[PDB]
Design a protein around this ligand. Structure first.
Ligand SMILES: Cc1ncc(COP(=O)(O)O)c(C=O)c1O
Ligand SMILES: Cc1ncc(COP(=O)(O)O)c(C=O)c1O
Ligand SMILES: OC[C@H]1O[C@@H](O)[C@H](O)[C@@H](O)[C@@H]1O
Ligand SMILES: OC[C@H]1O[C@@H](O)[C@H](O)[C@@H](O)[C@@H]1O
Ligand SMILES: OC[C@H]1O[C@@H](O)[C@H](O)[C@@H](O)[C@@H]1O
Ligand SMILES: OC[C@H]1O[C@@H](O)[C@H](O)[C@@H](O)[C@@H]1O
Ligand SMILES: OC[C@H]1O[C@H](O)[C@H](O)[C@@H](O)[C@@H]1O
Lengths: 422, 426
């Protein structure tokens, strides 16, 4: 049987990429800015004309397990035929066991399941505030949260209120108060911010994602945790982009040996199949959310839970932390040896595991020529902040595939440089 | 071959046998932000669910109107499995062969120029608020940071900090501040109060439900929405109409706003947009409003993902193919008529039976009866629901409920209320 979307699309006679871009332009809210993908499998996607590419954005680390992982799809399909949604107003035979699975895997007492990263962030801030008011006993409406410049956690009004990125906040106010912004990767600024006794939490990414793959100094996060703990301030660690093996370890916080007070997960939690996010913490923090104080229609639905248990298990069974660590060190090494020196407009090669970036001098080169050239050579990515090229493949990428992609990526940077010399 | 999926292997290894075993698992590992009816549902199909002990029930919450098409509608599940084999996520950073055609499908079905797909109701409300504000600053040219949005007391649109900031429900806001400013709360179903609030020129929008759901199935006087729209239009204020609960045939029309012949300036949809299969929401509006969201000013990882779009197109088509608007109008009018003729005369602690379509409620007097006795008795008679605000009993079945099931269910419901009354007389 043809699905309704397929039958409906056939009647439109969208044959070329430009037909799809025109349909897009006419009917889709125009809040995004080259290719029309119809199929994905593992590390590979295919456009509507049958051309193959490596996906080096991977849902900005939502597709760590690869596109259309057969185990994840089987778990989806099996659960979807049985039960998808009950609400948390009724019990069911999936939510409990799934939260226990997550509790045991990440080492926490309680799991709050929500749907998106932004909801996980809001839920953590809410928990941190109510905890501050109720357990830490700080004055009513006075709770503060410390975040870092160039953070990204969502697009809610409150997320906009805690952004330093002009386009994220501009003309969406007035703003939620209670945020203090400091420099990333700066313990001094954190110590200084931590003198205010009304601070409920410090909310931080172990590597800043959308900010430009800003990898902090080794130990930064341990130091930050020590400072938070000595002031009775919760360390909220956002691993929505950096967790789940992406950096070579189950949590990017494992590098600095930090167990977050509140952990956020998302994205690859579902292998990019359905939106599910998680907030985890110890009992005396998470239990501030009493009945009726927080909710979500779809949060914890049995379909997402079944998908997430399968997705998480893929990470472990395919040993994807080891694969990210190994391949990623080889990637950065090749790019350093074959590009530093030969390509003067490369500012920095940086990353951990398979979360990598090449920042370029956008005064010396058009970054978009790198993007175009990459696509020409079978590599799809999208930079952040104009000038930071991102390289974020599915972790399941094979040794042969990764060698091949690395060659095409290097060849792309070199072809842009040769064209510049003329 | 034969094999377990991991959720099954793991659950099997925990050796959970009784409902108490599952209740205890939930209490230990799941954040305790709900007060659930004590049942452990295992299978859902159409209007029915079964628990782990085998007991069968009619689902009379239906995900609070997330499952209008029934549990596990075979067409929606087939569309889900088919698209999931092919492509589930690209981001809007890349094009794909589904997202644009799905937005076009919706734009044409609802009559709007532009469609924004988000994931949850809360995200749709946040996005609409962002649109109305930026539009106010850039098109209406009101002063920087001065935009106001009018909402109604007892509204419910989400649990973000900004939603908490615009709530009048104590447990939604308490100890979650400090709050997002820029909200002006008025009584629901009060034209005079809306009129006075609209005298402030910094008002960007009026954000309103055609029936308040979580607030208690509060059905306004007829014409209330039409009148709200005329007032908003005369002051160059956007009418944002939240149909996340009331939309998609639930009230006997495609949109509840259709009763008043209102076309919202911004329309919010969600919940049954996916037939309860995956979270997807939508914000729709005319080009000169929606186009304020320029590249880089708003986004979402999973918003408009191809899996969700294929499910939503299938879910929407089910509404039309099974004529669920007509089924809701008919069955709902019979339900309310039956309940009034069988319960009002006999049951003194029912204050009111109200609703539209198959969005119905029975408000009880909780100073006279423990509402939880009604919930328990319903369950014992094969009916699952959860009240809102302590004392508003909700009857919101899947619209696919058959005539025979609906009659059977209505008998069970009437018998439940009369039995609690019989205990009260004693
Ligand atoms: C670190 C981090 N937090 C939060 C989010 C928000 O995710 P969502 O788009 O699922 O709301 C993202 C997505 O880009 C992210 O990378
Ligand atoms: C009218 C209305 N708006 C918004 C929401 C928020 O939906 P979600 O729980 O999917 O965020 C709901 C659902 O509870 C609703 O009924
Ligand atoms: O020129 C018209 C545009 O829209 C489509 O109708 C055509 O197929 C494309 O070639 C073009 O981008
Ligand atoms: C890809 O690579 C691995 O993740 C899995 O074992 C394959 O089944 C999948 O097609
Ligand atoms: O046939 C429907 C589905 O049922 C599940 O039990 C299988 O493992 C899936 O792969 C299959 O697509
Ligand atoms: O709530 C019961 C209701 O039925 C429907 C009509 O819209 C209402 O005006 C009537 O009061
Ligand atoms: O549809 C009405 C239903 O009501 C009865 O309780 C029967 O037990 C059930 O099998 C039947 O299908």
């Amino acid at each position: 049987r043809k699905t309704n979307i397929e039958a409906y699309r056939d009647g439109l006679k969208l044959k070329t990429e430009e037909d799809f871009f025109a349909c897009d332009r006419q009917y889709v809210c125009q809040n995004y800015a080259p290719v029309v993908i119809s199929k994905g499998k593992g590390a590979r996607v295919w456009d509507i004309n049958g051309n193959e590419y490596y996906d080096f954005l991977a849902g900005v680390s939502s597709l760590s397990q690869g596109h259309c992982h057969p185990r994840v799809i089987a778990a989806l399909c099996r659960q979807a035929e049985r039960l998808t949604l009950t609400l948390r107003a009724f019990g069911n035979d999936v939510t409990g066991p799934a939260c226990r699975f997550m509790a045991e895997m990440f080492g926490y007492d309680r799991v709050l399941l929500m749907n998106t990263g932004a909801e996980a962030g809001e839920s953590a801030l809410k928990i941190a505030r109510k905890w501050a008011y109720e357990v830490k006993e700080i004055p009513p409406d006075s709770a503060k949260v410390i975040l870092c410049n160039n953070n990204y956690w969502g697009r809610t009004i409150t997320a906009c209120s805690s952004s330093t990125t002009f386009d994220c906040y501009n003309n969406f106010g007035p703003f939620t108060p209670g945020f203090e912004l400091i420099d990333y990767d700066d313990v001094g600024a954190l110590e200084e911010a931590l003198k205010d006794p009304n601070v409920a939490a410090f909310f931080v990414e172990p590597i800043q994602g959308e900010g430009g793959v800003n990898v902090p100094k080794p130990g930064y996060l341990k130091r930050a945790h020590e400072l938070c703990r000595s002031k009775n301030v919760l360390l909220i660690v956002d691993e929505i982009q950096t967790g789940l093996c992406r950096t070579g370890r189950l949590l990017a916080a494992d590098h600095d040996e930090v167990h977050p007070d509140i952990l956020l997960l998302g994205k690859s939690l579902s292998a990019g199949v359905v939106p599910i996010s998680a907030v985890m913490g110890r009992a005396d923090v998470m239990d501030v959310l009493k009945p009726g104080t927080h909710g979500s229609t779809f949060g914890g639905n049995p379909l997402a839970c079944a998908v997430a248990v399968e997705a998480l298990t893929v990470l472990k069974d395919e040993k994807l932390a080891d694969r990210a660590e190994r391949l990623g060190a080889q990637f950065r090494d090749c790019l350093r040896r074959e590009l530093y020196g030969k390509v003067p407009w490369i500012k920095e090669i940086r990353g951990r595991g398979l979360l990598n970036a090449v920042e370029v001098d956008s005064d010396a080169i058009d970054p978009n020529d790198v993007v175009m050239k990459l696509k020409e050579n079978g590599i799809l990515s999208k930079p952040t902040r104009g000038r930071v090229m991102r390289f974020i493949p599915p972790l399941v990428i094979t040794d042969e595939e990764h060698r091949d992609a690395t060659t095409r990526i290097i060849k792309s940077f070199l072809a842009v440089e040769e064209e510049r010399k003329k």
